[PDB]
Design a protein around this nucleic acid. Structure first.
Ligand code: MG
Ligand code: MG
Ligand code: MG
Ligand code: MG
Ligand code: MG
Ligand code: MG
Lengths: 142, 143, 171
RNA sequence: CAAGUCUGGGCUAAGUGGUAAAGGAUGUGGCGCCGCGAAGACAGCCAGGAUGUUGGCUUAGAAGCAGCCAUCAUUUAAAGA
């Protein structure tokens, strides 16, 4: 449906693809290049999702519920500036300390909330990137 | 004839027949337009409060198992349910009614021990007979 | 499984005669003879008409489905047997009616004057679209074929005479 | 053109007969096996097939569908970034 973005880290850029293309999209853009600009302000770039909605007429909808899947990754986790040939070298290795509860922010909506869920969800473009990282030394069944 | 493990741990796991006593049990399908109802894929980490599969597998032959008396709501057998939080909170947590949110959810069959019919209208429309039972403390005979 | 040969068709305002090698349908829109095989009893019943076959071997089965679908089709025939869209996409291209006859222009040094054969009737409401009123089925599907064949429908460009779908367009 | 339009059973629709092979083929008839199926198979058709997502790597952008690739991981009737 009605979906696109506005980014990258701070000092929002409505560039030729990122917000001047608001015509037959929502079109009240003088005061709402400013009510999103505190909803992606002072957070830091790694991905920062943008949720945008549909209407009968012209304005006023929600923003986002979580920035996962490469974000709580390349702040300090997994040292994952995960260099080209995406990496069978350990471009950076961790455990589930900067992955599992760095974001219980994940819990708004990925449909599974208890944390072997959206924790290991975001260990998808983090953990299985070549070096499937680790959640433990493999629980020791007994 | 594998009778595939799709039937084996999904043939009830003999659960909800013995789980959240296996009766009061009632109406309403294996699925229609997927937008709305919800706590679909959200009942905290499971779908312990919904179901998964298989009208032909269980309901045709599963058996009589585990009960409470007779019947009859609106109609009879084609697709059914799973929960502990029945008639009162069966409907402050799910499946509002008439038509519904999405486009008008449809049909099923029940059996508890409260003697009678439909299960939609009088029993299942956020009926607060919990907050209208401090109405009975002086009713029907008192001076 | 589930063969097109031996279901049972339909009633209600239509006739049936069974000559030994032809069935005469003759419903409200006109009549249709059906040349039919002289094997295959075609037995008529109450408001239905089944066909059974003398053996169950590969060569008798193919003839069975055919002669069912051949009759059934003549029964929807004598009730709303017409069809066939012909949306005329492309720029200079416009069809129009004159007489009982269709005259369409799809970019030659002349318009092409089709005339309708019997049991066929031309309609061009909204002249980038032209429908074929037909009783038969197969004469209908033919005259629509022929009409379409006059212009392309390329294949590099959305101009020509189109049935339905198909943006094909190679580049 | 002398003597069977002889008698029973089945095959072939090519005028094969009245021919030339590797090789091919839902021609056709017959004998087998094996897979899946009335706790419901194969056709169809009815319904749904995602999110965070843009996967990362490259990048006016590839956001499955320009790609070289880690192609995840939950979830779940069921859905491959
Ligand atoms: Mg002689
Ligand atoms: Mg003879
Ligand atoms: Mg010859
Ligand atoms: Mg020859
Ligand atoms: Mg050979
Ligand atoms: Mg064969």
């Amino acid at each position: 449906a009605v979906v696109k973005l506005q980014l990258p880290a701070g000092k929002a850029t409505p560039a030729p693809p990122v917000g001047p293309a608001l015509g037959q999209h929502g079109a009240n853009i003088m005061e709402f290049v400013k009510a999103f600009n505190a909803a992606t302000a002072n957070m830091g770039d790694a991905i920062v999702p943008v949720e945008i909605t549909i209407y009968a007429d012209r304005s006023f909808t929600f923003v986002t519920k979580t920035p996962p899947a490469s974000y709580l990754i390349r702040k300090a986790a997994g040292l994952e500036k995960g260099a080209h040939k995406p990496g069978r070298e350990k471009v950076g290795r961790i455990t589930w300390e900067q992955v599992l509860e760095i974001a219980k922010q994940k819990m708004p909506d990925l449909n599974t909330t208890d944390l072997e869920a959206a924790a290991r969800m975001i260990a998808g473009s983090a953990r299985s990137m070549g070096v499937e990282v680790v959640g433990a030394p493999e629980v020791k069944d007994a | 004839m594998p009778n595939k493990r799709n039937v084996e741990l999904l043939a009830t796991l003999k659960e909800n027949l013995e789980r959240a006593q296996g009766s009061f049990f009632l109406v309403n399908y294996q699925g229609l337009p997927a937008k709305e109802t919800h706590a679909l894929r959200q009942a905290l980490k499971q779908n312990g409060a919904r179901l998964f599969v298989a009208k032909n597998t269980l309901i045709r032959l599963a058996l009589k198992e585990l009960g409470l008396p007779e019947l009859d709501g609106l109609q009879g057998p084609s697709a059914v349910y799973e929960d502990p939080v029945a008639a009162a909170k069966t409907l402050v947590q799910f499946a509002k009614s008439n038509p519904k949110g999405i486009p008008q959810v449809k049909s099923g069959l029940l059996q508890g021990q409260i003697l009678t019919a439909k299960d939609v209208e009088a029993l299942a429309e956020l009926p607060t007979m919990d907050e209208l039972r401090a109405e009975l403390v002086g009713v029907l005979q008192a001076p | 499984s589930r063969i097109g040969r031996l279901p049972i068709p339909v009633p209600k305002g239509v006739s049936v005669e069974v000559a030994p090698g032809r069935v005469k349908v003759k419903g409200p829109k006109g009549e249709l003879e059906v040349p039919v095989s002289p094997e295959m009893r075609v037995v008529v019943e109450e408001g239905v008409v089944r066909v059974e076959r003398p053996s169950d071997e590969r060569r008798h089965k193919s003839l069975h489905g055919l002669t069912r679908t051949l009759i059934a089709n003549a029964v929807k025939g004598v009730s709303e047997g017409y069809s066939k869209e012909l949306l005329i996409k492309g720029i200079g291209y416009r069809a129009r009616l004159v007489g009982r006859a269709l005259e369409l222009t799809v970019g030659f040094s002349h318009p092409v004057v089709v005339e309708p054969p019997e049991g066929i009737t031309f309609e061009v409401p909204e002249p980038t679209r032209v429908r074929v009123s037909g009783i038969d089925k197969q004469k209908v599907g033919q005259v629509a074929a022929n009409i379409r064949a006059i212009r392309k429908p390329s294949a590099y460009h959305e101009k020509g005479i189109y049935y339905a779908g198909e943006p094909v367009r190679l580049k």
